[PDB]
Write a protein that binds this DNA or RNA. Structure first.
Lengths: 25, 80, 150, 140, 97, 91, 129
RNA sequence: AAAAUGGAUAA
RNA sequence: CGCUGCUGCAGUUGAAACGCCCGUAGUUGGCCCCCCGCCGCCACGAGGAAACGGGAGCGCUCCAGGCAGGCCCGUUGGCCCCGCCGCGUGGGACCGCGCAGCGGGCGCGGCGCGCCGCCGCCGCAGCCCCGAGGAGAGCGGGCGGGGGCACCGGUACCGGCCGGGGACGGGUGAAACAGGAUGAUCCCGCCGAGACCGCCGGCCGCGCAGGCGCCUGCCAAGACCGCCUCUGUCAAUCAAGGGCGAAGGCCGGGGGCUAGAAGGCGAUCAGACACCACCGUAUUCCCGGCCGUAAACGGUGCCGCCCCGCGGCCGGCGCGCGCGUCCCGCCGGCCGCCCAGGGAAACCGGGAGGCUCCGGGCUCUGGGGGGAGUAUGGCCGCAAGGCUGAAACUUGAAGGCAUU
C-alpha cells in the first residue's frame, strides 16, 4: 500500500490541524 | 423452403411461445373427463389450477397442476 | 421488468384471436351474468369468478360469452368491491408482513419487502384516487392498515 | 450519455453545459476572474516597476546556464515580481532602484522555456528601450 | 490488461465465496482462487507395497488409502510447482493434465 | 413543538449538568420506567412501575413482578422459555 | 417501456438487410410506421409491406428488395423551418441528389422534395436511403 | 537463510 | 478546439456509472378512436427607426469612399433586412388536453338570433375499443448457502483432570526464547468453555446489494414457469428525501475458545524495533445502538428492442418416441467459445454490436499532469471520520493497450 499510506499521512495532518486549531481558538 | 413470416408452417407457430407467434393466442383448450352417469361430453379447463368437483358428487374430478390439470378417472380428448 | 425486482419474465395468460362466444357449450347471457353475481354474494373475488367459469363452466374470458368484463357485470348489481380488488389484495399482504415483523425487529429482508409492498399501495391508490375509483379522503396508513382492511 | 433527448429538456440542457463548461481549464482561468485579481500585471499588457535587486537563477538541469534576472516591485499593486533581463549583456544597463517596464513572456503568464521562477520580461529600463540600448539606437 | 476473463477466480453469480487457507502459506484465498487438487494415496509409501501385507496377519486386508483434498494458495502453488506460468495461447486450454 | 431537538427529551430535566454519556443511558433506562406495558392477563397497555420491580396494571389492578425498569427483562424471557421446554420434557 | 415504436422498428428493417433477410419482421405497429413504409415502397427503397391484424399490437410484415442502406428515425422530432430544411438535409442526406427525409406537415406525411416544392416545413420523422 | 547502493550531462 | 459536443464528446482499462434499493420534483413515455375546440405547430401576411449588414446603378483619376450626377425613370439615391415566442388570415400531419347524452317544437323569444328553460316528443344502434413479448394483481406447480426466531449435533483447538510412563519437548530456513524429574512430549477415558460448520462445495444455486452452508421445529417472503383468471396504462428514470450496506472502528451490556492491530520477546542482519518463531491486550463472539466506507468490480449506470452458431449448467414447462430421469425444444437465469460488427489495441460480441452512413427515453460523471479531496464555509457523526468542495501556484508531459 503506497497511496493508502499517503491517505493515512493526510488524515494525521488533518487531525493535528484540528487539535492545533482548538489550542489557538 | 422459401416460407416467409406472412405464412409460417402451423407447427412452427405451435412450437414457439404463445406470445412469440405471428398470431398470438391460447395454448390451452377444453379437455373432457368421464363421470358416473356420463358417456357424453363433460368439458373442463385443460390447465385447471383449481378443484373441479364430480357433477353432483363430493370427490374432485381434476388434480391441481401448474400445467395441464391431471385426472384420476376415465377422460375424453379435447372437444368431441 | 417486474415493478420491484430486476426480473424480465413473460408468463402471461391468453385470449383468443377470434373474439366470438364459446362454441363448446356456452350458457345464456342473463344466466351467466346472474351466475357471476350469485357467486359474488358467497363472496367470490373477481379473479376467482373469472377462474371458476374457466374450470367450472365453459369460457375463461367472460367478456366474449357475456357482453363485458367481470367487474362491469358485477358493478351493475353493486358487487364491485368498494376498495378496488387490486389495492385490497396488496393491503391484505402488507398486514401479514407487519404481523411477522411485530414479533422480531431482527428480520431485514421482510422490512425490505414491507417498504416495497406498501410503496405499490401508495402508487396504485393514487391512480385510483384521480380515476375516482378511490375517494380523495381515503389514504393508506401503515398503522391503520388493519382498520382499512376491515 | 448526453441524453436529455427531450423536446422539453432545453432548461436542463442549457445549464448542464454552463455548469460543466467551467471545468475546462482554459475557460476556468479565462472567466473565473481569479487571475484578473492574481495577475501581478493586473491583466495589463505591461506594468511599471522599481528595480529591487539583480538575481541569478540557474536554468533547468538539461540546459545549464545562469539566467540573469531582476527583482522588480510593481508600481500599481506593489507586488514583488521577478523579470528576466533579455538578450546578451543587458544586465550592465540595468541599475538598482531604477524604473522599469515589465511585459508577459507570451505563454500567457506561464514560464517560457528553461527560466525557473520567471514569468515576465523587461521591455524598457529607465524609459529608454532595452532593445534600443542593445541595438545601440538609444544609449544610456 | 485483463490477463484472463475469469479475472483469476471462478466466482460467478455470487459476489462472495467461503474463504479457506493455503496448506503451506496459511494465506486466506477465497474458495474460487484455490488450487484444490484431490489426493488419494496408500498410507505407507508404495515402496512398502506388499512388505506390509506379507507382515499383516489378517487375511485380505487392503493398505488404507487417504482421500484428502489439498487446498493450496495461488502464490504457494507456483513456487511449489503445482501449476506453472502458461503461455498466452496455452492459458485458455483446460483438459486437466 | 420540537421541545428538545435531540433525544434528551426525558433527560431535559437534569439540564446542563451530569454529562452527555451519563444522561444518554438515562434516556433508555428512564423511558423504560415511565412507558406503559401490556398486562399479560388483560392485554391492555396499562401496566406501570409502582416501585422498583413492583408493576401494577392501572386498569387490571393486578400486580406482576418484573425487571426493575421494564416489565419483561431480557434474561428472564430466556429462562422462562427454558422452563417451558424443560417442564414438557418430564411430560 | 418501448419509448419509440418507429426507431426500434427501423433499426430492425436495416438489421435484416445487412444479413440479407429478404423477409423482415416488425413486432409493434403504429399508423406512422405504416405511413413511413408506403412512402418507402412508393419510392421503391422497399418492395412492399403488410400487417397481420392480431387483435393486440398488430405485427407488421416488411419485404425489402434488398436494395437498402440506412433507415433511421430523427427523434427528438424537431420541427424544421421551411427555409432551412436543407441544413438538416446536409447532415442526414448522402448527396443533395438522392435520399429522402420524411417530415410531418398538415397536408399529410410528405418527403423532403414535396416539402420544398410546397415551400412547407414539418417535424422530422426520419431518413431513408 | 543472508545481500544495500550507484553522481549530471551528452553520447 | 467533435479541447464544451443541440448539430457533434467521453465514462471496461487513458479522466469519469453514485455500493444498492425506494422514491417526489422534474424529464420521458405503447397501441388505438378520419373529418372539433384549445394548444404547440405549419405557411403566408400586415404593421414594426434609420444607420448597419448586404444590395441595383452611378470611373471621387483607380480606390478606401460617397449619393451622387447629367443635357437624365416626375434623373437619381432604390431594394432586401428592426426577426417580431407580439398581432391577423389560412392549414390539421405529428403532438398533447378535453368529465359532460344528443336532437325537434314551443323561439322571429318586444327590429334576427340566442341563453336559462319546457316537457316526453319516439325521433338517434343513445352510451362496455382492444387486451402491450408495459406493468399492477390471482391461483397452481415445483425451485433455492434467500430472511427472522428458536431448537440444535459434531469433531477440532484450548484449559482442568485420572490411570500410565519415562526423558528432552517444542520451534525453524537453520536456530533461539519459553514447557519438563512441580514427571514434560506422547497416548487413552474424561470434564469445562467458547468459536466454527470441513469433505460434499461447483464455469452450483439464492438474495435488492453487502452477502448467504450443523440438527429439527416454526413463521412470514421472493423471482421464475404454467395459465380460455383479474383490472386496464396504473409505465420509465431520477433531483430532494427515506431505507439497507463487507471489514475495521466506536457506545452500553455481556462473553472469552482460537487467531490476533499494540506491546513485549527471541533469532535476523551494518541496523533492523521489519520479514520468520514464541507470548499476548484491543479485537474476533453475542445483544441493543451509532458509523457509512471498499480493487463495494464486470473498474462496464437503469429500463427498451433487434441481433450466429456450437455448447455446459439451472428452474419450471410442454410434444412425439418406447417409455428413458430419453429426444426436440418453449420460456427466466448462470456461463464458455465466438459469426458478423465495433474499437488505439487488450479484446466485448446475452455488448464494449446495430454511430462521423452520428438523434428510443431517464439519471450520474469527467475535460493535460501535480497542487487537491487540499483549504475554507457548511452539514452529519460520541469520536475516528464521511458527504459537498476551492483557489493561488507549478509543470510538459502525465497516462492506455500493444511490439521489440
Amino acid at each position: 500500500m503506497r497511496a493508502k499510506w499517503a491517505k493515512k499521512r493526510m488524515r494525521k495532518l488533518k487531525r493535528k490541524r484540528r487539535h492545533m486549531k482548538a489550542r489557538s481558538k | 423452403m422459401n416460407v416467409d413470416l406472412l405464412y409460417p408452417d402451423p407447427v412452427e407457430e405451435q412450437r414457439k411461445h404463445k406470445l412469440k407467434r405471428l398470431v398470438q393466442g391460447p395454448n390451452s383448450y377444453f379437455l373432457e373427463i368421464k363421470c358416473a352417469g356420463c358417456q357424453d361430453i363433460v368439458v373442463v379447463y385443460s390447465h385447471a389450477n383449481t378443484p373441479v368437483f364430480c357433477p353432483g358428487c363430493t370427490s374432485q374430478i381434476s388434480i391441481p397442476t401448474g400445467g395441464k390439470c391431471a385426472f384420476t378417472s376415465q377422460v375424453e380428448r379435447y372437444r368431441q | 421488468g417486474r415493478m420491484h425486482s430486476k426480473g424480465k419474465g413473460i408468463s402471461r395468460s391468453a385470449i383468443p384471436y377470434t373474439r366470438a362466444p364459446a362454441p363448446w357449450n356456452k350458457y345464456t347471457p342473463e344466466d351467466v351474468c346472474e351466475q357471476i353475481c350469485k357467486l359474488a354474494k358467497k363472496g367470490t373475488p373477481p379473479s376467482r369468478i373469472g377462474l371458476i367459469l374457466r374450470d367450472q363452466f365453459a369460457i375463461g374470458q367472460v367478456k366474449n360469452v357475456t357482453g363485458s368484463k367481470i367487474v362491469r357485470i358485477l358493478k351493475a348489481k353493486g358487487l364491485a368491491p368498494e376498495i378496488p380488488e387490486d389495492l385490497y389484495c396488496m393491503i391484505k399482504k402488507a398486514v401479514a408482513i407487519r404481523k411477522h415483523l411485530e414479533r422480531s425487529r431482527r428480520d431485514k429482508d421482510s422490512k425490505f419487502r414491507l417498504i416495497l409492498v406498501e410503496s405499490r399501495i401508495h402508487r396504485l391508490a393514487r391512480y385510483y384516487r384521480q380515476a375516482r375509483r378511490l375517494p380523495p379522503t381515503f389514504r393508506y396508513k401503515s398503522d391503520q392498515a388493519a382498520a382499512l382492511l376491515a | 450519455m448526453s441524453k436529455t433527448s427531450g423536446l422539453y429538456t432545453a432548461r436542463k440542457l442549457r445549464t448542464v453545459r454552463r455548469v460543466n463548461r467551467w471545468a475546462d481549464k482554459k475557460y476556468r482561468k479565462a472567466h473565473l476572474g481569479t487571475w484578473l485579481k492574481a495577475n501581478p500585471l493586473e491583466g495589463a499588457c505591461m506594468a511599471r516597476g522599481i528595480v529591487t535587486q539583480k538575481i541569478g537563477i540557474s536554468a533547468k538541469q538539461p540546459n545549464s546556464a545562469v539566467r540573469k534576472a531582476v527583482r522588480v516591485q510593481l508600481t500599481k499593486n506593489s507586488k514583488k515580481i521577478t523579470a528576466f533581463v533579455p538578450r546578451d549583456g543587458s544586465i550592465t544597463y540595468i541599475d538598482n532602484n531604477d524604473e522599469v517596464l515589465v511585459a508577459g513572456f507570451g505563454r500567457a503568464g506561464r514560464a517560457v522555456g528553461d527560466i525557473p521562477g520567471c514569468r515576465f520580461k523587461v521591455i524598457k529600463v529607465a524609459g529608454i528601450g532595452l532593445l534600443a540600448l542593445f541595438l545601440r539606437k538609444r544609449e544610456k | 490488461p485483463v490477463k484472463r476473463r475469469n479475472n483469476g477466480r471462478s466466482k460467478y453469480n455470487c459476489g462472495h465465496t467461503n474463504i479457506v487457507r493455503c496448506q503451506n502459506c496459511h494465506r486466506c484465498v477465497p474458495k474460487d482462487k484455490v488450487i484444490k487438487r484431490f489426493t488419494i494415496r496408500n498410507i505407507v509409501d508404495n515402496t512398502i507395497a506388499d512388505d506390509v501385507l506379507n507382515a499383516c496377519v489378517i487375511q485380505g486386508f487392503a493398505i488404507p488409502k487417504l482421500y484428502n483434498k489439498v487446498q493450496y494458495c495461488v502464490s504457494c502453488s507456483i513456487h511449489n510447482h503445482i501449476v506453472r506460468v502458461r503461455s498466452r495461447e496455452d492459458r485458455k486450454i483446460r483438459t486437466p493434465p | 413543538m420540537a421541545k428538545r431537538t435531540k433525544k434528551v427529551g426525558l433527560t431535559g430535566k437534569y439540564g446542563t449538568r451530569y454529562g452527555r454519556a451519563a444522561r444518554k443511558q438515562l434516556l433508555k433506562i428512564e423511558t423504560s420506567q415511565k412507558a406503559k406495558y401490556t398486562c399479560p392477563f388483560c392485554a391492555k397497555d396499562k401496566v406501570r412501575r409502582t416501585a422498583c420491580g413492583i408493576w401494577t396494571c392501572r386498569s387490571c389492578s393486578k400486580t406482576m413482578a418484573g425487571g426493575a425498569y421494564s416489565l419483561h427483562t431480557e434474561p428472564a424471557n430466556a429462562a422462562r422459555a427454558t422452563i417451558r421446554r424443560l417442564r414438557l420434557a418430564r411430560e | 417501456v418501448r419509448i419509440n415504436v418507429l426507431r426500434d422498428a427501423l433499426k430492425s428493417i436495416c438489421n435484416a438487410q445487412r444479413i440479407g433477410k429478404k423477409q423482415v419482421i416488425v413486432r409493434p405497429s403504429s399508423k406512422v410506421i405504416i405511413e413511413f413504409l408506403q412512402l418507402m415502397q412508393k419510392n421503391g427503397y422497399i418492395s412492399d409491406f403488410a400487417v397481420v391484424d392480431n387483435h393486440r399490437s398488430n405485427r407488421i410484415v416488411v419485404n425489402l428488395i434488398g436494395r437498402l442502406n440506412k433507415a433511421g428515425v430523427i427523434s427528438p422530432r424537431f420541427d424544421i423551418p421551411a427555409n432551412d430544411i436543407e441544413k438538416w438535409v446536409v447532415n442526414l442526406l448522402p448527396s443533395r441528389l438522392f435520399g429522402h427525409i420524411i417530415l410531418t406537415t398538415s397536408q399529410g406525411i410528405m418527403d423532403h422534395i414535396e416539402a420544398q416544392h410546397r415551400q412547407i416545413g414539418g417535424k422530422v420523422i426520419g431518413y431513408f436511403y
